[PDB]
Amino acid sequence: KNPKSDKFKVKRFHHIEFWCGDATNVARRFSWGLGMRFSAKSDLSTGNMVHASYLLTSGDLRFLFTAPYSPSLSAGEIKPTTTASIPSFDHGSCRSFFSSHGLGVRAVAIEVEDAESAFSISVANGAIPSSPPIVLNEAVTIAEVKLYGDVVLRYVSYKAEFLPGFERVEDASSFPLDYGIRRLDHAVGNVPELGPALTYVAGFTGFHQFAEFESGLNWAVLASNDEMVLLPINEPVHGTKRKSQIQTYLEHNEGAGLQHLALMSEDIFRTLREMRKRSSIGGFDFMPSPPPTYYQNLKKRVGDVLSDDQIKECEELGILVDRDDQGTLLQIFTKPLGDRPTIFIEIIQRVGCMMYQSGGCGGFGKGNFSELFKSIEEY
Amino acid sequence: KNPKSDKFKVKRFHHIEFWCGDATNVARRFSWGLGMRFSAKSDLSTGNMVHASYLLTSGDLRFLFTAPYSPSLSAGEIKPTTTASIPSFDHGSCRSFFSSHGLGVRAVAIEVEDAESAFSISVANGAIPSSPPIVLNEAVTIAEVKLYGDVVLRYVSYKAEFLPGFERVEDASSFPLDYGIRRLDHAVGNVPELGPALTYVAGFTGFHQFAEFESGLNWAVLASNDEMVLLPINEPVHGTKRKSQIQTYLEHNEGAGLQHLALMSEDIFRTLREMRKRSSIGGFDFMPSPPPTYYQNLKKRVGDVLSDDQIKECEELGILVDRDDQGTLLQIFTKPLGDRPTIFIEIIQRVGCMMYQSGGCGGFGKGNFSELFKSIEEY
Numbered sequence A, B: 001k002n003p004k005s006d007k008f009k010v011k012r013f014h015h016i017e018f019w020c021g022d023a024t025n026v027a028r029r030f031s032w033g034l035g036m037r038f039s040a041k042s043d044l045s046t047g048n049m050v051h052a053s054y055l056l057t058s059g060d061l062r063f064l065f066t067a068p069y070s071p072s073l074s075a076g077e078i079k080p081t082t083t084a085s086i087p088s089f090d091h092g093s094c095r096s097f098f099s100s101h102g103l104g105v106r107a108v109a110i111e112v113e114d115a116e117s118a119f120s121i122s123v124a125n126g127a128i129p130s131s132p133p134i135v136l137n138e139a140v141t142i143a144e145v146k147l148y149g150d151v152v153l154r155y156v157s158y159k160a161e162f163l164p165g166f167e168r169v170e171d172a173s174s175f176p177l178d179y180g181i182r183r184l185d186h187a188v189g190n191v192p193e194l195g196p197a198l199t200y201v202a203g204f205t206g207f208h209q210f211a212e213f214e215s216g217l218n219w220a221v222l223a224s225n226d227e228m229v230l231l232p233i234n235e236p237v238h239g240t241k242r243k244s245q246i247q248t249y250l251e252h253n254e255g256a257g258l259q260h261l262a263l264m265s266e267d268i269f270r271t272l273r274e275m276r277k278r279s280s281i282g283g284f285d286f287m288p289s290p291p292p293t294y295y296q297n298l299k300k301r302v303g304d305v306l307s308d309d310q311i312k313e314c315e316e317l318g319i320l321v322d323r324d325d326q327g328t329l330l331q332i333f334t335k336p337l338g339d340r341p342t343i344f345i346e347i348i349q350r351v352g353c354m355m356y357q358s359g360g361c362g363g364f365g366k367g368n369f370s371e372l373f374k375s376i377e378e379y
């Protein structure tokens, strides 16, 4: 059941912004690890004396990496005279965020019809304002409200190239890497209490609970009208045999924040071949692969969707498979992206639900918790 | 003239420690960019609840990358019960360093006969203490004094594997990258006033001025007895046509600090081929190459040392060449390693001065300032 209750017009995920200590090194590591190209910059060379921001793209996926310069470079500026290209940026907020949480997502940005209206409707419906709407070069409007922890939901709307003041990156410095990743499928938060977090976000967005279908967590998924913006939220389950990975996150992160980004691939097998080739030479590592048990049990579950060859290809790459009543999900998880056992990445590809493909086809892997436990015990 | 006045027994450069916001991403970027392998770690997986430290090696070159965890993880510890593997580490100092200076070198570490004695003699001769000698597992002694800015000179001495509490990195996570880099040749500081900086450091080390042979700077080089530890120091020259790059450094760095690390290659042509292949796919960029003028003028200067083929190889890779009365220096400079126009890397190879090769053979490139200016003007 989809009541289609969005309180303003939402289009798609627009970008994810990481707050960094050094944007250059994180951006270069991510570019090589995920096969994303450098497409835009805003930094000293573009006249920005406040922050360094570098944009990576793969398909429609946009990752922005931002770090503060010395405040002394901009000490004479005021907000009317700022050289920052993202006017919500604040030196103190960024340093406090990074010192508190380490490397992680500051902003989940969605494109909307009218960012000013989205901001106003959100705050009228309980959203905690973070940065008021500001029009950039009479062309783009950006506004921010609190999502959870120190993560903001950023609204971006375009009258009619990333943001004003960003310059497209020179061809020589823009190598056309591509491992097949094409868009952000969902962005997941960890919170101490699910109930209040859901009530808050659903309260100011009108996002509805996305219909789905004892190991660590409870969760629910909030979704826009066409279910293309998907925001799952997790809470820990305490008192269990193995300590909840949600609680570990909250401890190492100093509270709520973004847990994982799930990146849709147009060919998950090529993406994982390319990413695993680079794991030990600057890229990303992946979670330990499931026992061959798990793949011996895949035939009975998805043998009508994947061939024996396509299944054996899952086993060599460590890919997980789950299934809805509507579609099939192929998924795999990286190890944490930085020093702390906090944020990680999921690579996914969805099979089925053709009409274009409807959002969330095949779910989020709920059935893979039970399947993995059974495999582990029976090994 | 070498008075051999070291006040304690100095061996070689031991390691360089970067203070980071996220050690993982900087270490992975540097590993791929410079061809250094992951060889040791001290982090949560080794019981260290205080800091994450990752060691990269290439030959005898050791780069250590360190970042703080949340202080909450170790809030119950005191120094007698610390889980830190580097007992000089302090959360507040590290966060203050990184917020002030951005990514950069905290420690220039040299191996000595007796770190306790080196510390005592240094402080008795004017060194400002930073961290007193501490014996690690009855096996290694480490001590630190101030060098310039917030950079420390770290003394390490071994009774008889990097440091106690570090674990060697698993073979699967340790890819044997190697682009030919073999050791640290020199480490260079930028200061506002050369005179007082030289008097201070030479005062507590007994290092002597290394004999050498109007564009931005003045400098001098301090050297150990066998001139294998080489510490040049730069100051700005004000009032010039083009603004001094030393002054730009001091402004963007918030004061004195380490300007460049010069890394000796056993085959600079292979190193630069490998590094330039990776510039746009996560590695390091290089300064703009000199005009072909410069290479047209190389024949008259070093045609007795390099063949026409070896010279043309310099031109395609952008390598600079200078010459002493004793030897020849091949050198090239990266663009800044991170967001700020502060620290960068030099790759070098030295030809001549055979006896082993004596330290500093061919100088530091003093003659390349005049040669580059002449080339530029005449283009």
Ligand SMILES: Cc1c(C(=O)C2=C(O)CCCC2=O)ccc2c1c(=O)n(Cc1ccc3ccccc3c1)c(=O)n2C
Pocket (backbone or CB within 6 Å): A186, A188, A216, A219, A232, A234, A242, A243, A244, A245, A260, A262, A287, A333, A346, A364, A365, A366, A368, A369, A372
């Ligand atoms: C992150 C994720 C999802 C996922 O995407 C997701 C959504 O999008 C929204 C709903 C909530 C949710 O979870 C699905 C399945 C997953 C994992 C995962 O992270 N893991 C790794 C793991 C799980 C427990 C652990 C407990 C202790 C120690 C390590 C552990 C590692 C899995 O095994 N499955 C099977």
Ligand SMILES: Cc1c(C(=O)C2=C(O)CCCC2=O)ccc2c1c(=O)n(Cc1ccc3ccccc3c1)c(=O)n2C
Pocket (backbone or CB within 6 Å): B186, B188, B216, B219, B232, B234, B242, B243, B244, B245, B260, B262, B287, B333, B346, B364, B365, B366, B368, B369, B372
């Ligand atoms: C860093 C270095 C060295 C070097 O190693 C070194 C030592 O070890 C100790 C003695 C002091 C010293 O310098 C040698 C030559 C160099 C450079 C360099 O950095 N550069 C790049 C540049 C120079 C001016 C600029 C002025 C304005 C704007 C950009 C500029 C870029 C060079 O051209 N030469 C020719």
Ligand SMILES: [Co+2]
Pocket (backbone or CB within 6 Å): A186, A188, A260, A262, A346, A364
């Ligand atoms: Co997911």
Ligand SMILES: [Co+2]
Pocket (backbone or CB within 6 Å): B186, B188, B260, B262, B346, B364
């Ligand atoms: Co040098």
